[PDB]
């Protein structure tokens, strides 16, 4: 009972949601630029900055609701589209449904929209993580730097183009557009003085990875003069060319993943970036790198053994997990947890397009939400106690009971409790790896789920418990409704996403 | 342990006594019982028990375990 | 026990107290972060109910 209306419903919703976000951004930018001469905040109640914040937060939220509706439309459309090809067994008739373009708005960048489940999962992560990050950046945007309230809308538009185009060049460009806003956020919004060098490190590392990916895509474009994945399907690369391409894409997207030994930039940036960007950096952009690697490697036939890449990913996991005990800084500890989770997810994409990308996508979403929650907790601790080191703050549970409870439940969720989606992703990846390599699977599970977990819990349990004896005059208050609701939404997603349709997982 | 003063602003549970705890107990027990009754009905829809005393499973009945016909 | 002081006569047997959150009950700001997050929660719940529950 799947008719033509739902197809156009999904396509129209995707295109017009992109245009909704773009029109909101354009109107907000026009108002911001043409209402003031200097375009800095006027320090009074009657300021455009209030309207800018309202417009951006509401654009993000309403476009997220529209994206939920369009994601459900896409799920139904994709299920029934795969069904229609599978359904008919008669050899005389084939599924030939040719669609028309909409009349009101043009195809942006003259490209037909192609939607995949991984792309829309990435877009949903973009929406939610950007919402949380912008909610975590209101205290940082002030006089002369309010212009970065539009940064997350720019990210949403870039990724919306990124996950909906079948053009390989537009794909690469949208992957490449995520650097300038990120560097601008780290350079101008970060309060720490050490964040300038962190921004430089982030730029240079991610741009070396981008150069490697650029070499790979240049090979792809120059050899087979096209920009379509189907045209790639109609072409074969020799063994040497395929080896060079896979090495280049893996190394670049692992510079962005990050992977061992290319996570120094991530550690420095996470320690020094503002908490909102740290939520957005760990939660989302690395997932864009994963999506790029998945799109690049799946479309190319590779005949080499992936044991080297698997070893690199597992070494990254082990290296990140063994360093969690020696971290007295909660934000750096969360950064190492992000490194571990990212390397685990990147491991799942080392078997091509087998039934291993499902665990990769689920773990990408789970790590997005977990990293957002953990960096948000670090933000709350740093805003309350004005410190992040374990030697300066402890006994949070007794002065700020809600923050301590949130920390404890974050640890429970991070320990892979079966009710949540981290356990599902671990089950997928570890079952596949155990059937692939049992001893390496046991090594990965031992180092990650015991040693790394022990260190991670040690650095958080010591902060949660104790006595906040010093500075009783300066002790903060409990959690506000915004932080409480953000934490509860992270918990709610990590719990209820286990009940998502298993067709795509 | 000797009682010590607790800050008024702190939402902690140290030596907390609610004078109206009886109605709170009523209105936290009975709706919980109703919710658990509904969940119990839902789970009793999907419930399996072995045959009672004196009852055997006919191997040719549809209830008996089945094997795949390739 | 030997010398027990009942709840009424106890000077340190607290009744329920404390502020639930850090939000000022008498806050005069048109702050909308709480409303936005409540809207996000409710719309997500409705989308699950109205699109995915059955």
């Amino acid at each position: 009972m799947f008719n033509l209306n739902t197809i156009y419903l999904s396509r129209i919703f995707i295109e017009f949601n992109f245009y909704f976000l773009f029109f909101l951004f354009l109107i907000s930018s026009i108002i911001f630029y043409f209402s003031k001469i200097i375009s800095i905040q006027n320090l009074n109640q009657n300021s455009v900055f209030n309207f800018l914040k309202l417009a951006n937060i509401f654009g993000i939220l309403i476009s997220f609701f529209i994206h939920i509706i369009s994601f459900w439309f896409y799920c139904i459309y994709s299920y029934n589209l795969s069904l229609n090809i599978f359904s008919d067994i008669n050899l005389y008739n084939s599924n030939s449904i040719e669609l028309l373009n909409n009349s009101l708005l043009p195809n942006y960048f003259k490209s037909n929209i192609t939607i995949d489940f991984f792309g829309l999962i990435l877009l949903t992560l973009a929406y939610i993580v950007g919402f949380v990050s912008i909610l975590a950046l209101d205290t940082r945007l002030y006089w002369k730097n309010i212009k970065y309230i539009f940064s997350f809308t720019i990210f949403l538009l870039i990724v919306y183009v990124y996950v909906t185009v079948s053009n390989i060049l537009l794909f690469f460009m949208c992957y490449e557009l995520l650097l300038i806003p990120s560097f601008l956020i780290v350079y101008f919004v970060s309060p720490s003085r050490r964040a300038i060098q962190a921004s430089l490190y982030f730029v240079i590392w991610t741009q070396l990875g981008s150069l490697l990916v650029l070499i790979a895509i240049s090979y792809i474009i120059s050899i087979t003069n096209t920009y379509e994945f189907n045209d790639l399907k109609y072409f074969n690369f020799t063994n040497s060319e395929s080896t060079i391409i896979i090495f280049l894409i893996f190394l670049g997207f692992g510079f962005k993943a990050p992977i061992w030994p290319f996570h120094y930039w991530l550690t420095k940036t996470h320690v020094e970036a503002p908490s909102g960007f740290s939520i957005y950096l760990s939660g989302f952009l690395v997932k864009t790198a994963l999506y790029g690697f998945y799109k690049f490697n799946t479309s190319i036939f590779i005949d080499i053994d992936s044991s080297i890449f698997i070893a690199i990913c597992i070494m990254g996991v082990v290296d990140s997990s063994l360093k969690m005990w020696g971290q007295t800084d909660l934000k750096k500890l969360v950064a190492y947890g992000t490194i571990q989770e990212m390397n685990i997810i990147y491991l799942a994409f080392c078997w091509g397009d087998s039934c291993a990308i499902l665990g990769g996508i689920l773990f990408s979403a789970t790590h997005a939400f977990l990293s957002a929650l953990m960096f948000f907790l670090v933000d709350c601790i740093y805003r309350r106690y004005h410190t992040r080191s374990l030697v300066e703050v402890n006994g949070i549970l007794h002065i700020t009971p809600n923050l301590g409870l949130s920390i404890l439940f974050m640890l429970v969720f991070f320990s892979g409790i079966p009710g949540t989606i981290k356990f599902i992703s671990e089950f997928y990846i570890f079952s596949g790896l155990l059937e692939a390599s049992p001893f390496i699977c046991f090594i990965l599970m031992l180092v990650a789920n015991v040693l790394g977990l022990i260190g991670f819990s040690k650095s958080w349990f010591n902060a949660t418990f104790g006595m906040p004896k010093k500075n009783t005059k300066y002790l903060p208050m409990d959690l506000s409704f915004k932080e409480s609701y953000i934490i509860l939404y992270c918990f709610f997603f990590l719990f209820i996403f286990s009940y998502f349709s298993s067709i795509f997982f | 342990f000797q009682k010590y003063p607790i800050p008024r602003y702190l939402h902690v549970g140290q030596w907390i006594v609610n004078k109206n705890w009886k109605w709170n107990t009523f209105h936290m027990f009975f709706p919980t019982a109703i919710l658990c009754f509904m969940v119990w009905r839902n789970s009793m829809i999907s419930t399996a028990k072995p045959p009672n005393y004196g009852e055997y499973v006919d191997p040719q009945s549809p209830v008996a375990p089945k094997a795949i016909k390739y | 026990d030997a010398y027990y002081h009942d709840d009424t006569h106890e000077g340190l047997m607290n009744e329920p107290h404390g502020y639930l959150t850090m939000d000022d009950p008498m806050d005069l700001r048109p702050n909308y972060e709480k409303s936005a997050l409540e809207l996000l929660f409710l719309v997500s719940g409705g989308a699950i109910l109205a699109l995915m529950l059955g």
């Binding site: 020696g326 971290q327 007295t328 006595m467 004896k469 010093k470 | 342990f1 000797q2 010590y4 | 030997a2």
Partner: peptide, 27 residues
């Protein structure tokens, strides 16, 4: 009983004063 005891002293939770460098090798 038999004496009006003051409230529990703040000495019940003595403030620890760091007299030594917290070495990073003892992290």
């Amino acid at each position: 009983h038999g004496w009006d005891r003051p409230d529990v002293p703040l000495s019940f939770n003595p403030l620890y004063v760091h007299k030594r460098e917290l070495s990073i090798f003892d992290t």
